[PDB]
Amino acid sequence: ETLGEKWKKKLNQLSRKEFDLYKKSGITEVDRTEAKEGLKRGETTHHAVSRGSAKLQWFVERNMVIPEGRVIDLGCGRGGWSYYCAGLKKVTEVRGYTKGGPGHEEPVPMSTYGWNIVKLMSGKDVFYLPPEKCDTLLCDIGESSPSPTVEESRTIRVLKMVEPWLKNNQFCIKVLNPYMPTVIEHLERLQRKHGGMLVRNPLSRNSTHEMYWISNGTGNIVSSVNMVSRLLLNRFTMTHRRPTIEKDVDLGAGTR
Numbered sequence: 001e002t003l004g005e006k007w008k009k010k011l012n013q014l015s016r017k018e019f020d021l022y023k024k025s026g027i028t029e030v031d032r033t034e035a036k037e038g039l040k041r042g043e044t045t046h047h048a049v050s051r052g053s054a055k056l057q058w059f060v061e062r063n064m065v066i067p068e069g070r071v072i073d074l075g076c077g078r079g080g081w082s083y084y085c086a087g088l089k090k091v092t093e094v095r096g097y098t099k100g101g102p103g104h105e106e107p108v109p110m111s112t113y114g115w116n117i118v119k120l121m122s123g124k125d126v127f128y129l130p131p132e133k134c135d136t137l138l139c140d141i142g143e144s145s146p147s148p149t150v151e152e153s154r155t156i157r158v159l160k161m162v163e164p165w166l167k168n169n170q171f172c173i174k175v176l177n178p179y180m181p182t183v184i185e186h187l188e189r190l191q192r193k194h195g196g197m198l199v200r201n202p203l204s205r206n207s208t209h210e211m212y213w214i215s216n217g218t219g220n221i222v223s224s225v226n227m228v229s230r231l232l233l234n235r236f237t238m239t240h241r242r243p244t245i246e247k248d249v250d251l252g253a254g255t256r
């Protein structure tokens with residue numbers, strides 16, 4: 001039994017009160033107050049449509065993924081990753097696919113910087129989508145579940161789905177449950193072929209063990225995974241530490 005499996009058992013034992021204090025203890029988060037207010041009023045400039053823009057920006061600013069050319073954004077939701085990439089100098093086209101419908105977010109139309117090079121499509125289950133040529137492959141799919149076996153199945157499914165999209169291009173792919181032994185085996189095989197590394201984003205909540213497989217890096221998958229498991233277990237042992245609050249992204253306005 002993995003350290004991550006022990007973390008999951010502990011997370012499942014929490015009351016709603018305990019879970020709510022735990023999930024943000026010691027994490028980093030952007031202040032969405034101004035963006036939520038502007039979006040509520042129907043504003044289409046400057047605001048990021050979700051917390052996603054800042055989450056991807058964290059990786060991009062550290063050169064972990066360098067979006068360029070034709071960007072494919074799988075599970076785009078409201079469009080946080082897409083509208084962020086649309087503003088980047090090297091990016092020429094952004095194509096977002098999302099499921100939408102009940103239980104899913106719909107793409108939000110925006111007028112942020114470079115909006116004209118973005119096309120977001122809803123009603124698109126990526127598990128039935130044929131792979132397309134692209135210079136950047138983004139994937140943020142992976143629904144949390146109290147069952148680690150359900151998360152293990154969902155993660156493997158995403159990992160098998162993304163592989164044909166990967167052809168010596170830039171990438172950033174969510175790995176929902178990276179601690180299950182069968183997932184680690186798939187990741188090790190994938191890293192031997194396509195390279196890259198698994199990275200923990202400080203904007204992720206403690207209630208998820210999600211890590212992201214980024215194209216620009218190397219390192220021991222097992223060690224990076226166990227380091228996250230150790231962090232998340234230690235965050236149960238102390239009293240709630242308020243999250244580090246950072247400024248949210250300004251995505252500007254204007255065409256490209």
Ligand SMILES: C[S@@+](CC[C@H](N)C(=O)[O-])C[C@H]1O[C@@H](n2cnc3c(N)ncnc32)[C@H](O)[C@@H]1O
Pocket residue numbers: 049050051052053074075076077078079080081082097098099100103104105124125126127140141142
């Ligand atoms: C974590 S959210 C993405 C948030 C986004 N990165 C942002 O910045 O706003 C994952 C999204 O994947 C979508 N999704 C889940 N399964 C899907 C599938 N099979 N095909 C397409 N979209 C799916 C969900 O509806 C959800 O909106």
Ligand SMILES: Cc1cc(N)c(N)cc1Cl
Pocket residue numbers: 100101102103104105106
């Ligand atoms: C519940 C519900 C959510 C969405 N996103 C859509 N498109 C339709 C319905 Cl009925």
